[PDB]
Write a protein that binds this ligand. Structure first.
Ligand SMILES: Nc1ncnc2c1ncn2[C@@H]1O[C@H](COP(=O)(O)OP(N)(=O)O)[C@@H](O)[C@H]1O
Ligand SMILES: [Mg+2]
Length: 271
């Protein structure tokens, strides 16, 4: 069985799953809808194209090592994995509401009730990862999935563990998306778990006004290193002081003063 992209879907996958349409894509993966034949239950099939070397070998990947460990309602669950020489197949929980990048483009901005609930979901996921010493390093809207409840309410689920790792002393790899990257990453002075809180702070800021706190014009990186968070008029005039205070504590350049996920969850705006 060959997909439209040319993927040679393993026999064991096609035996138990009916592979459907592409529901999402990224730089490294193609994600499809699929249906477990025995139950008619829907799942997502994530297909990761592995990095090729000279010769017949392919480079090894880290994502499954982290995904196997993580089980939380605000994290996309891994169901099964199938490694073949050229690609890796991941059967995951299907999140029918799509991603937060498309949601933000469609809706523009959110109410404080909606944004606070979304931050509670994200900070809940981060608290759980940080309890396991796992830093995600790629928290941003395209990696957040919108779960739609039977009553119409929504919850966020964190996905894409492609850059995730274990923090056992400071990390130095410069990685991430400029809009969401913590100043200590760009500064190359050593970073840890709280780069995820900075990313969450940037997302919360975007949810309430529709644009990021550091937009640049070099100026972008200088803005991030200085960390001056502005709440410009009229866009932020009707937003509460409580929301602004929490976003400020999440976007502190001083990592020791910056909130932990626990401190975010304890803040009155998310309670
Ligand atoms: N489990 C899932 N359920 C529904 N859609 C999913 C999904 N996992 C991923 N997606 C969609 O596929 C896109 C890319 O998947 P992701 O895991 O982020 O791959 P990547 N590393 O290439 O960026 C996501 O932005 C989202 O639109
Ligand atoms: Mg992604």
């Amino acid at each position: 069985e060959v997909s439209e992209e040319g993927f040679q879907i393993p026999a064991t996958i096609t035996e138990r799953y009916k592979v459907g349409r592409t529901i999402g894509d990224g730089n490294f993966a193609v994600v499809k809808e699929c249906v477990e034949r025995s139950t008619a239950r829907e799942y997502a099939l994530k297909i990761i194209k592995k990095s090729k070397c000279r010769g017949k070998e392919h480079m090894i990947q880290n994502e499954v090592s982290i995904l196997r460990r993580v089980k939380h309602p605000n994290i996309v669950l891994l169901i099964e994995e199938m490694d073949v020489p050229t690609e890796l197949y991941l059967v995951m929980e299907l999140v029918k509401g799509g991603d937060l990048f498309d949601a933000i483009t469609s809706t523009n901005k959110y109410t404080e009730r909606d944004a606070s609930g979304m931050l509670y979901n994200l900070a809940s996921a981060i608290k759980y990862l940080h309890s396991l010493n796992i830093v995600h390093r790629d928290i941003k809207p395209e990696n957040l999935l919108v779960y739609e409840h039977q009553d119409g309410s929504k919850s966020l689920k964190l996905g894409d563990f492609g850059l995730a790792t274990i923090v056992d002393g400071p990390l130095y790899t410069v990685c991430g998306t400029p809009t969401y990257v913590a100043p200590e990453i760009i500064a190359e002075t050593g970073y840890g778990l709280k780069v995820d809180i900075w990313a969450a702070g940037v997302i919360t800021y975007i949810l309430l006004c529709g644009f990021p706190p550091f937009r640049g014009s070099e100026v972008l990186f200088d803005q991030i290193l200085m960390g001056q968070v502005d709440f410009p008029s009229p866009y932020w005039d009707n937003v509460s002081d409580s929301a602004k205070e929490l976003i400020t504590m999440m976007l502190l350049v001083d990592v020791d003063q910056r909130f932990s996920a626990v401190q975010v969850l304890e803040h009155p705006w998310v309670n």
